[PDB]
Amino acid sequence: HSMDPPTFTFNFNNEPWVRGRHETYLCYEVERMHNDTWVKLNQRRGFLANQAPHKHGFLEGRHAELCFLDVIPFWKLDLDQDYRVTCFTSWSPCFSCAQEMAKFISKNKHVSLCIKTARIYDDQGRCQEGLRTLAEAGAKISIMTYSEFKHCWDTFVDHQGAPFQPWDGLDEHSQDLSGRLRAILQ
Amino acid sequence: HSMDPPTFTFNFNNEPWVRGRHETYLCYEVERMHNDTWVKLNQRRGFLANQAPHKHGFLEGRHAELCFLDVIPFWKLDLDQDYRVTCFTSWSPCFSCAQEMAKFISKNKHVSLCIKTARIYDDQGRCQEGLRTLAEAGAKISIMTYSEFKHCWDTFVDHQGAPFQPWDGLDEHSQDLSGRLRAILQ
Numbered sequence: 001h002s003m004d005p006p007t008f009t010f011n012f013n014n015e016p017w018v019r020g021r022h023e024t025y026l027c028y029e030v031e032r033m034h035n036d037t038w039v040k041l042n043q044r045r046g047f048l049a050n051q052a053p054h055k056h057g058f059l060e061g062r063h064a065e066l067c068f069l070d071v072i073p074f075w076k077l078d079l080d081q082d083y084r085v086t087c088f089t090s091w092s093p094c095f096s097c098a099q100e101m102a103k104f105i106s107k108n109k110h111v112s113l114c115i116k117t118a119r120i121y122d123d124q125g126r127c128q129e130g131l132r133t134l135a136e137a138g139a140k141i142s143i144m145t146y147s148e149f150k151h152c153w154d155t156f157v158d159h160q161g162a163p164f165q166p167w168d169g170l171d172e173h174s175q176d177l178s179g180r181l182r183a184i185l186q
Numbered sequence: 187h188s189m190d191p192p193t194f195t196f197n198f199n200n201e202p203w204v205r206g207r208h209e210t211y212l213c214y215e216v217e218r219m220h221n222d223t224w225v226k227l228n229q230r231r232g233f234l235a236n237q238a239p240h241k242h243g244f245l246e247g248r249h250a251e252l253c254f255l256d257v258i259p260f261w262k263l264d265l266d267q268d269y270r271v272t273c274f275t276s277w278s279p280c281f282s283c284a285q286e287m288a289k290f291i292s293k294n295k296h297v298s299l300c301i302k303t304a305r306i307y308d309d310q311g312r313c314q315e316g317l318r319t320l321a322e323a324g325a326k327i328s329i330m331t332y333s334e335f336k337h338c339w340d341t342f343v344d345h346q347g348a349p350f351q352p353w354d355g356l357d358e359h360s361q362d363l364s365g366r367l368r369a370i371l372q
C-alpha cells in the first residue's frame with residue numbers, strides 16, 4: 001500500500017557519504033496518451049523492493065526491477081495504446097536487470113519507460129554498459145531532484161498529512177549525479 | 187552588500203494572492219566552459235533591481251532586465267569562449283524586455299542564458315509572446331523551486347547563517363507556475 005516514512009527517508013536519501021542502503025525500493029505509476037497529453041491511470045501505482053533470498057540458498061533474492069517486470073503483464077495494458085511507465089528507484093539497476101528491462105521494452109513497444117533514480121549504482125564492472133544498453137533500447141533515465149522526491153513522498157509514503165522534509169545537500173547531490181549520468185550515457 | 191533578508195522574502199515569495207511586489211529583483215551568476223564543464227566565475231555575480239522613474243517624468247523607470255543587459259558588456263567576456271549566464275528573477279520579463287533579451291542573445295552567441303523566475307508576469311497582452319520569442323532565441327526559461335530559492339538565499343542574501351525557511355505554499359505555487367509555463371511555451 002503506502003511506504004513507512006522512515007523507510008522512505010533512509011532509502012531515498014541521496015547523500016554520498018553514508019552506507020547501509022542495501023535495498024532497492026521502486027515506486028511506479030502509469031500514464032496513457034490521449035490527444036497529445038499523458039493522462040494518469042488512477043489505480044496503476046504502487047511500490048516494491050528487492051526480495052530476500054529463499055532459505056534453500058544458491059539463488060540471490062529477486063531484485064526489485066525483476067519484480068516490477070513481473071507485475072506489468074497483470075495490468076492488462078492495451079497493446080494499441082501508448083503508455084508511459086515511470087519508476088522512481090532508490091538505486092539504478094544492476095547490469096542483469098538493465099538487460100532484462102531493455103529486453104522487455106524492446107518487445108513491448110506500447111510502453112515508454114522512464115527511470116528516475118535517487119542514486120547511481122556503479123559497480124565499476126558492467127553497470128555502465130547496462131545503463132547504456134537500457135537507454136539505447138529507449139528508456140529515459142534521469143536523476144531525481146527535489147520535485148521528484150517531494151512527489152514520491154506525497155504519492156507513495158504513508159505521510160499522514162505531514163509534508164516532505166528535504167535533507168541537507170539534496171540539490172547539490174542531484175546535480176553531481178546528473179553530471180555523472182551524462183558521462184555514463186555519452 | 188548582499189541582499190537584505192526581508193527584501194528577499196518579500197520579493198521572491200511566490201504566493202499569487204498578495205500584491206505590492208512592484209519591483210523586479212534579478213540575481214545573476216556566470217560560468218565559463220572549461221574542457222566540457224561549466225565552471226563558476228564567482229567574481230561575476232551579483233544582483234540588481236528595476237530603477238525608479240526620473241523626476242522629469244514621461245519615461246518609466248528602467249527595468250531590471252535592461253540594467254542587466256547594460257552591465258554584460260562591462261564583464262569583458264571573451265567572444266571566442268562560451269558562457270552560461272543564469273538569472274534568478276522575481277518576475278518574468280515584460281514583452282519589451284523579453285524582445286530586447288532575445289535580440290541580445292541572438293547577437294551574442296558566446297552567451298547561453300538561463301532565466302529562473304519566482305513568478306510569471308502575464309499582463310494578458312504580449313507577455314506570453316515575449317516568453318515564446320525569448321525561448322525561441324535560445325533562452326532556457328524555468329520556474330524557481332525550493333532548490334533555487336534556497337540557492338539564492340544561501341548565495342545572495344545576508345542571512346547571518348540562518349537557513350532558508352520556505353514560506354507557506356512554496357512547492358504548490360511552484361508546481362502550478364511550472365504547469366502554466368509549460369502551457370505558455372508549448
Ligand SMILES: [Cl-]
Nearest residue numbers: 018019020021
Ligand atoms: Cl549505501
Ligand SMILES: [Cl-]
Nearest residue numbers: 204205206207
Ligand atoms: Cl504583486
Ligand SMILES: [Mg+2]
Nearest residue numbers: 015016017169
Ligand atoms: Mg553531502
Ligand SMILES: [Mg+2]
Nearest residue numbers: 201202355359
Ligand atoms: Mg498559496
Ligand SMILES: [Zn+2]
Nearest residue numbers: 054055056059
Ligand atoms: Zn526458491
Ligand SMILES: [Zn+2]
Nearest residue numbers: 063093094097
Ligand atoms: Zn538487478
Ligand SMILES: [Zn+2]
Nearest residue numbers: 240241242245
Ligand atoms: Zn531621465
Ligand SMILES: [Zn+2]
Nearest residue numbers: 249279280283
Ligand atoms: Zn521590462
